[PDB]
Design a protein around this ligand. Structure first.
Ligand SMILES: O=C1NCCc2ccccc21
Length: 277
């Protein structure tokens, strides 16, 4: 292994994001001229907030990921005060940014980007990992406009936490429990959001949002692509064992065979050129 890196190896630049117990800063490695997104965490603060398990899980999950649709962990190091995670830099920022920029996606772009997420979730779920906080804020875009999923501090490794209100699955509200199917619920909310321009469940506060979620209280705009609508109806299902893509429904095959995805070639999405937004 190369010698441990250290802060003085980098020219630090702008802050890219100010996460839960961390700050992500753009950094250029002097020796190589490579750009990394370095996640910086203060040890004392992590210890004080009882987040050692949190940070340990984050690093352990990220070390296991080796797929182009996920953030990559290249290196770690620490000094007296801080932990540093050297992560891939997603040049084009958040999916959410593009949703707001152009309002909503046409069918071709919805299909292409939904497929990348599904394909990413298939990989993740095959390793026994649940994300638990999947959302357009955490789905980044690379320079090449392919997705790069991030934010694994709150992930669960199969064999205690509630995500972002608008994407929380009903089972989390009624049991405290999460499963792979919880990510598929999030996927349904995201597809709806790509097409409609807004998340399905919206209200004045978390309480009222949680209320709508458990009553499955939402509806589709008039223009909603019919096959995407059918797909979302098969994902936004209160019973977690009946969502398209979960094990009880025989996995990712039937999800990927959905009519909405008819024209998708699943084997080499990362080699395809994304539709212009
Ligand atoms: O580009 C990024 N890569 C790592 C994850 C991240 C978080 C917040 C802002 C940017 C990034």
């Amino acid at each position: 292994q190369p010698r441990k890196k250290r802060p003085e190896d980098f020219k630090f630049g702008k802050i890219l994001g100010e996460g839960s117990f961390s700050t992500v800063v753009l950094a250029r490695e002097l020796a190589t001229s490579r750009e990394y997104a370095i996640k910086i965490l203060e040890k004392r603060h992590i210890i004080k907030e009882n987040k050692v398990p949190y940070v340990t899980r984050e690093r352990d999950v990220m070390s296991r990921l080796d797929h182009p649709f996920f953030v990559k962990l290249y290196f770690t190091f620490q000094d007296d005060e801080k932990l540093y995670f050297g992560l891939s830099y997603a040049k084009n920022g958040e999916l959410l940014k593009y949703i707001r920029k152009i309002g909503s996606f046409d069918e071709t772009c919805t299909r292409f980007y939904t497929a990348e997420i599904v394909s990413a979730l298939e990989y993740l779920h095959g390793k026994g990992i649940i994300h638990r906080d999947l959302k357009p804020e955490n789905i980044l875009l690379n320079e090449d406009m392919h997705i790069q999923i991030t934010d694994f501090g709150t992930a669960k490794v199969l064999s205690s936490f509630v995500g972002t209100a608008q994407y929380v699955s009903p089972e989390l509200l009624t049991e405290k429990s999460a499963c792979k199917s919880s990510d598929l619920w999030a996927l349904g909310c995201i597809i709806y959001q790509l097409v409609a321009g807004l998340p399905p469940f919206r209200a004045g506060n978390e309480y009222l949002i949680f209320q709508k979620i458990i009553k499955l209280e939402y509806d589709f705009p008039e223009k909603f692509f019919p096959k995407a609508r059918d797909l979302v109806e098969k994902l936004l299902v209160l019973d977690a064992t009946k969502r398209l893509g979960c094990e009880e429904m025989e996995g990712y095959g039937p999800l990927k065979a959905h009519p909405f995805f008819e024209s998708v070639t699943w084997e080499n999405l990362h080699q395809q050129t994304p539709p212009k937004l």
